[PDB]
């Protein structure tokens, strides 16, 4: 039963967000606030902060990572690293999504293309006091690609690679596309990449720092 | 696409909680804070307050009810009306659960015993600053029983009746049992009842007031 998120109290993970041209747009910081033990597995409550490239905080809140029975799931905070999301955030923006599951390829092996073990999820963001500033990010058809080492500024991590489709709606536009993400035990998302339906890179994020 | 929760801004629903002997233990109050429209359906953010029989607030927070595509789901706040939950709550207690789905029997008819349309869910509660005060409520094997009118102090509502099993764990004890709930469009839970595995009534709740 692997836990795909940091789980030591006080531990802090930083992930950087980039434009397709490699420019830094945002910095996401998670800090483990509390880890609780349950017979069926663990519960981790973490604080998140989303800031811009100059370190100004755009949004902060709490999220949860958990193991129940054999199964790990967590809040969809990470899909908020999509540019549409990052660009509409401020202190009055809130978000709600499903807890999304992350299968353990490393113990339960999967063939490339396996998808029935991955659940779909929808994240909605909205500004309190300004309803027009809202968004919906739907992630679906997630499937296994491979397991492989990914090299990042925080180090080299053996990861599970997943491919997914997504729909992003705001009152001003619909964007359709696809993405990849790579995740690892005790870290969560190590790397992600977003594309439009023409296969043109829109953005990406990479694990930048682990502070235990 | 029925929405099983109040959805007019400002609307307020009160549900009363009782011991098996009919004594009032707690009062739960939901107030619709904001309703947001998305192409795929609606998002409702509501504030909840849990109080004791004398009106002293035990816990408050926010929760979400939503329609996405054809499917309604919501936070598991209502399973917090179990006595173990009610009795451990204070201002420093927080809770996290899955968004749990509520099928629309009224449009998509179900035969008694149908269960594959209902998802399982786990709610965990914990006190910040006092880890020993925590709990887990697992709800599973939910299935359709019937549709029928239920008479309450707020009125008579045509409801879907569901049966479920549950496991309740705290560091001091495990309780195993089963329950029934009745839900209706634009209200949510109209009535619920909890039993232990000997079929002895442990508690119940009934819709008390709708203020639009
Ligand atoms: Ca497949
Ligand atoms: Ca498939
Ligand atoms: Ca059945
Ligand atoms: Ca079945």
The set of residues, in sequence order, having a beta carbon less than 8 Å from that of A7 and lying 6+ positions away, is: A32, A35, A42, A44, A65, A186
For tokens 């869910």, name the residue: B121
Rounded distance between C-alpha atoms, residue A106 and residue B38, angstroms: 38
CA distance B55 to chain A (A): 28
The set of residues, in sequence order, having a beta carbon less than 8 Å from that of A116 and lying 6+ positions away, is: none
Count of residues for chain B?
212
Domain A1-212: which CATH number of 3.40.630.30, 1.10.645.10, 2.40.360.20, 3.30.70.20: 2.40.360.20
Whole-Å CA distances, B102 to A16, A51, B81, B180: 38, 37, 18, 14
Determine the distance separating the centroid of ligand 1 and the alpha carbon of A114, expressed in angstroms: 5
3-state secondary structure of B84: helix
CA distance A23 to chain B (A): 32
Listed residue (B116, B121, B117, B179) closest to A40, CA to CA: B121
Rounded distance between C-alpha atoms, residue A54 and residue A58, angstroms: 11
For B88, which DSSP code? H
B120 in Cβ contact with B141 (< 8 Å)? yes
Whole-Å CA distances, A184 to A156, A163, A188, B154: 10, 15, 5, 51
Residue A190 φ then ψ, to 5°: -95, -35
SS3 assignment for chain A: CCCCCCCCCCCEEEEEEEECCCCEEEEEEEEEEEEEEECCEEEEEEEEEEEECCCCEEEEEEEEEEEECCEEEECCHHHHHCHHHHHHCCCCEEEEECCEECCCCCCCCCCCCCCCCCCCEEEEEEECCEEEEEEEEEEEEEEEEEEEEEEECCEEEEEEEEEEEEEEEECCEEEEEEEEEEEECCCEEEEEEEEECCCCEEEEEEEEEEEC
Residue B87 φ then ψ, to 5°: -70, -15
For tokens 């179990």, name the residue: B82
Q: What angle (nearest 5°) sits at the alpha carbon of residue A74, between those of residues A68 and A77?
A: 170
Q: Do A126 and B40 touch (CB under 8 A)?
A: no
Residue of A36, A40, A122 with shortest CB distance to B68:
A122
Query: Hey, what's the torsion of the CAs at A131, A92, A50, A182, to 10 degrees?
Result: -40
B87 in Cβ contact with B59 (< 8 Å)? no
B122 in Cβ contact with B94 (< 8 Å)? no
Listed residue (B83, B32, B75) closest to B58, CA to CA: B83
For B78, which DSSP code? G
- The domain segmentation of chain A, as residue ranges, is 1-212
B2 in Cβ contact with B185 (< 8 Å)? yes
A198 in Cβ contact with A205 (< 8 Å)? no
Q: Is A190 left (phi over 0), alpha (psi -120 to 50) or beta?
A: alpha
B190 in Cβ contact with B152 (< 8 Å)? yes
With CA atoms as reference, the chain A residue closest to B133 would be: A36
Give the method used. Answer: X-ray
Instruction: Say how far residue A72 (Cα) sits from the centre of its chain.
Output: 14
Rounded distance between C-alpha atoms, residue A82 and residue A17, angstroms: 9
Whole-Å CA distances, B196 to A121, B56, B150: 34, 28, 23
Chain B interface disruption, residue of A96, A133, A167, most B CBs within 10 A: A96
């Amino acid at each position: 039963c692997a836990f795909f998120f940091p789980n030591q109290e006080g531990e802090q993970i930083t992930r950087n967000c980039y434009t397709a041209d490699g420019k830094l747009t945002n910095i996401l910081v998670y800090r483990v606030d509390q880890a609780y033990e349950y017979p069926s597995g663990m519960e981790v409550v973490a604080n998140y902060t989303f800031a811009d490239a100059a370190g100004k905080t755009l949004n902060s809140g709490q999220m949860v990572a958990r193991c129940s029975d054999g199964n790990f799931s967590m809040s969809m905070g990470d899909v908020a690293t999509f540019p549409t999301a990052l660009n509409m955030m401020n202190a009055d923006v809130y978000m709600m999504g499903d807890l999304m599951n992350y299968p353990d390829a490393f113990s339960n092996p999967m063939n490339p293309g396996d998808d029935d073990e991955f659940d779909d999820g929808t994240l909605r963001l909205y500004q309190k006091g300004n309803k027009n500033n809202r968004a919906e990010i739907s992630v679906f058809d997630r499937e296994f690609v491979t397991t492989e080492t990914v090299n990042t500024p925080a180090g080299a991590f053996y990861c599970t690679k997943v491919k997914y489709e997504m729909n992003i709606w705001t009152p001003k536009e619909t964007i359709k596309g696809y993405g990849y993400e790579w995740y690892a035990p005790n870290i969560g998302i190590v790397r992600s990449e977003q594309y439009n339906n023409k296969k043109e890179l829109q953005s990406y994020s990479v694990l930048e720092r682990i502070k235990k």
